[PDB]
């Protein structure tokens, strides 16, 4: 399971790339989705490689992000341990987070919005013109590397 | 194109590779297809009779009946539905 974050806008972006991001329920900049690791899903993130930031999150980080940025399928309601317990198949946030990582279920399947609408990176990102291997913030990240971005986008 | 004829720009598609030269094997020329069957349209360069317009080479149509010995195959050209009269010699089964 990888976490996708659109870091580049829609203007001048190819339509077939734009539509892939819309298929991955990600419509704005700084938005985040939890995409599984299939052949079909990998073909999609590879096509989005230059306009996104992906990698596998740590259980600790996924939890932090879900607590602060997860929303129900409809409404303002804060997703806390009590919300999870009353609406999901799990006990707390950790139980849901473990399931998302082990690819047992999806946010949509549990009545949550497939999008974790994040805040801009505190202290800023490493740049949207170069990949991670060149010192930027585009493409595939380390598990420790994606956390730094996901946590900065609390 | 310098001309709008049927065989315009068809040097490649309507020519055989040297080893596939000469008369084609009869087994495929007398193949029996049933209605609803998905078939692959590809002209055999060795067979003169029963062809279609080269623009449809590569289509995968659906057999919807026959007209004499030739088959009436339903395809979709872009967005327009078309019915192609073609013999078995230029058809292969799907899957």
């Amino acid at each position: 399971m990888h976490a996708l974050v659109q870091l580049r806008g829609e203007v001048n972006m190819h339509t077939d790339i734009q539509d892939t991001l819309e298929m991955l329920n990600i419509h704005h900049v700084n938005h985040c989705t939890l995409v599984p690791e299939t052949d079909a899903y990998r073909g999609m993130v590879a096509k989005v490689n230059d306009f996104v930031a992906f990698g596998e999150p740590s259980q600790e980080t996924l939890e932090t992000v879900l607590a602060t940025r997860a929303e129900p399928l409809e409404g303002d309601a804060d997703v806390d341990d009590e919300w999870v317990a009353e609406h999901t198949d799990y006990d707390d946030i950790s139980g849901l987070a473990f399931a998302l990582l082990s690819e047992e279920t999806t946010l949509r399947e549990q009545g949550l919005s497939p999008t974790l609408r994040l805040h801009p990176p505190r202290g800023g990102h490493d740049g949207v013109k170069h990949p991670v291997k060149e010192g930027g913030q585009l493409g595939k990240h380390d598990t420790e590397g994606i956390d730094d971005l996901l946590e900065a986008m609390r | 194109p310098s001309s709008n004829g049927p065989l315009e720009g068809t040097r490649g598609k309507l020519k055989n590779k040297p080893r596939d030269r000469g008369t084609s094997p009869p087994q495929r020329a007398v193949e029996e297809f049933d209605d609803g069957e998905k078939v692959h349209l590809k002209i055999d360069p060795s067979v003169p009779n029963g062809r279609f317009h080269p623009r449809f080479d590569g289509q995968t149509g659906t057999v919807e009946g026959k007209q004499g010995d030739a088959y009436k195959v339903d395809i979709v050209d872009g967005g327009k539905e078309k019915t192609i009269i073609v013999t078995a010699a230029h058809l292969r089964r799907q899957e």
Partner: protein, 186 residues
């Protein structure tokens, strides 16, 4: 053979056994082929339909399995030809085959020949094959009159082994009668 551009003919064409141009025309009918072959000492007659991995033979008759019914004469002639054709057509009727088309292969369509006699046999067995009556031999040459009248120009016998002297085309009549019988183990 020479290089990459060289075109090696289809196997049964290198072997000079199949006329692929005539085969395509034969298969166009949809009807099963009555394969009529002839060897020096023998005559073969098969009923072949088209299959997925090659041809299928549903009924056949070789002139060697003719002696199983009472033949004591040679097997590569006109009376033998008809009978091998009748025996093929009869087994065909038992297989559920009703109509056919004559495949003479690489043989010549010479009037009154053995391959046309094989066809006359199958027609008389109950099979519906598109023919032409005046391209077949007159009933006596099918019976074996030409051979008996060659033994009339005797001095020395025509046959080596002891079948008979003046030859009997009556054996043909007796054998056609044996096969026309409703009983018989086919």
């Amino acid at each position: 053979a020479t290089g990459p551009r060289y075109k090696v003919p289809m196997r049964r064409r290198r072997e000079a056994r199949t006329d692929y141009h005539q085969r395509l025309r034969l298969l166009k009918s949809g009807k099963p082929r009555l394969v009529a072959r002839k060897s020096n000492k023998h005559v073969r007659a098969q009923l072949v339909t088209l299959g997925p991995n090659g041809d299928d033979t549903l009924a056949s008759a070789h002139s060697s399995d003719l002696a199983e019914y009472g033949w004591e004469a040679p097997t590569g002639n006109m009376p033998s030809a008809y009978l091998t054709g009748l025996l093929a057509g009869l087994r065909a009727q038992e297989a559920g085959v009703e109509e056919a088309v004559l495949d003479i292969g690489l043989n010549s369509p010479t009037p009154g020949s053995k391959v046309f006699a094989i066809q006359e046999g199958a027609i008389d067995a109950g099979l519906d094959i598109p023919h032409n009556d005046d391209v077949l031999a007159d009933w006596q040459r099918t019976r074996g009159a030409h051979i008996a009248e060659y033994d009339e120009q005797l001095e020395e016998p025509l046959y080596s082994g002891d079948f008979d002297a003046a030859d009997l085309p009556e054996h043909f009549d007796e054998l056609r009668e044996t096969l026309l019988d409703g009983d018989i183990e086919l």
